[PDB]
């Protein structure tokens, strides 16, 4: 009945003083914007229809047109920053926040969706949505004894919009807004719907990506155990954001990293460091490198869980980015480790693959490799076995690579390998 309309027909129907004709035209616009292939968002905007849709959003006496205009504006705001700005410039934020309290669930859900798109555009529109007072009604929509009594899609959209209100930095969300939202995210993180869990983990990972104050805000709520549980989840959409959140948390202070360790996260890394998804392996190796840069008791915890062999394996065979994260982990290990710990690491067979990566064509990883070599040689000098490690590095064919790098473009690697060759092979 309203399929394949022309923008001219839509404008003619909207410009009529007939509420029913206006509703038909708005429905037609919604349907036209609900096609996967090239929605004419720019044509609709140029026709000046956004103000009309925003005005329709407030016709409480005609909820059908409210829903249709909400859908159309949602689809428009889901496009480029220019189109989202066009939607916002029509005053749609206050209208959607008002409709959040609609008696019709399918209209409040559309308001949630539209506000989520607007907030997800960026930190500016996010802070503007927060300034119009959306957090209060959004969270009120979730004030129920049991979250399972709400519609699945409704809860999923609410969680996604909250995550968008939590995401983006420069600047990060308002601290008081994060304090207001965090309890509901904890509740949602203990929910059972996989998509809601993924969105909640993504929100937490957003909040944990920043200064240690935010990490502390998140950790004080005691969600780290649940984050580790979800880290052990079976669904990759849930494991990925949980691992990102754990990594963000361990980038903070040693005390927050210790809180993470106490939750048992390391016990899950045997499989994460061998996970089939290369992104998961890279993220897990990055987390392990950030963990090995901490205190010595934490390095000993890493050792006890048997993860040094897994780091050796990742350094021996894995995507180059995962291998770089592993090189960083090994360098941090050797920089902060105990002489006994460096000895154990070498005994696990790290020297051969660590020299194997010396043939890499990335200056930074070569610098990291040589910095770790310096640390290990210092440990050997302390223990009095420098000649042993010299013979080792020379037997696996690595000192050939160090002699080669002696004439390297970068000056840092140049000086490092030169110092090594001169102080250990002369």
């Amino acid at each position: 009945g309203t399929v394949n309309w022309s923008v001219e027909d839509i404008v003619k129907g909207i410009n009529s003083n007939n509420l029913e004709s206006q509703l038909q035209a708005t429905q037609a616009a919604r349907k036209l914007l609900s096609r996967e292939k090239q929605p004419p968002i720019d044509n609709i905007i140029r026709a000046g229809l956004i103000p009309k849709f925003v005005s329709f959003l407030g016709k409480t006496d005609c909820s059908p047109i409210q829903f249709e205009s909400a859908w159309a504006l949602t689809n428009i705001a889901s496009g480029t920053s220019e189109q989202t700005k066009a939607v916002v410039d029509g005053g749609a934020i206050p209208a959607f926040i008002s409709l959040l309290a609609s008696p019709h669930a399918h209209i409040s859900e559309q308001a949630v969706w539209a506000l989520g798109n607007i907030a997800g555009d960026g930190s500016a529109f996010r802070d503007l949505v927060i300034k119009h007072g959306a957090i209060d009604p959004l969270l009120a929509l979730l004030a129920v004894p049991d979250l399972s009594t709400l519609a699945c899609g409704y809860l999923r959209n609410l969680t996604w919009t909250l995550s968008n209100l939590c995401r983006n930095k420069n600047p990060a969300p308002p601290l008081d807004a994060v304090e207001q939202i965090l309890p509901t995210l904890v509740r949602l993180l203990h929910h059972n719907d996989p998509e809601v869990l993924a969105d909640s983990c993504w929100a937490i990972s957003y909040l944990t990506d920043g200064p240690n104050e935010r990490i502390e805000m998140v950790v004080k709520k005691g969600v780290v155990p649940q984050l580790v549980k979800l880290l052990g989840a079976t669904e990759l959409p849930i494991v990925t954001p949980a691992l990102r959140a754990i990594g963000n948390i361990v980038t903070g202070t040693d005390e927050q990293t210790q809180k993470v360790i106490d939750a048992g996260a390391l016990a899950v890394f045997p499989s994460l460091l061998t996970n089939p998804k290369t992104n998961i392996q890279k993220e897990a190796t990055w987390t392990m490198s950030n963990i090995t840069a901490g205190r010595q008791d934490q390095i000993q915890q890493v050792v006890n869980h048997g993860l040094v062999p897994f780091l050796v394996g990742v350094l021996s065979k894995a995507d180059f980015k995962t291998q770089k994260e592993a090189a960083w982990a090994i360098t941090n290990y050797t920089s902060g480790g105990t002489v006994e710990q460096i000895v154990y690491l070498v005994h696990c067979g790290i020297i051969e693959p660590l020299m194997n990566l010396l043939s890499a064509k990335d200056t930074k990883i070569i610098q990291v490799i040589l910095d770790a070599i310096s640390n290990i040689f210092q440990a050997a000098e302390k223990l009095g076995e420098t000649e042993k490690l010299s013979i080792m590095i020379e037997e696996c064919g690595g000192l050939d690579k160090i002699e080669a790098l002696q004439r390297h473009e970068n000056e840092s690697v140049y000086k490092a390998s030169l110092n090594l060759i001169e102080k250990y092979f002369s």
């Binding site: 689809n75 705001a77 969706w113 995550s163 969105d199 993504w202 840069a293 941090n332």
Partner: peptide
């Protein structure tokens, strides 16, 4: 010993 440092941002309701 030095520490270092995606889902849809927008969604259209499609039929």
């Amino acid at each position: 010993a030095k520490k270092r440092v995606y889902p849809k941002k927008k969604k259209a309701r499609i039929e």
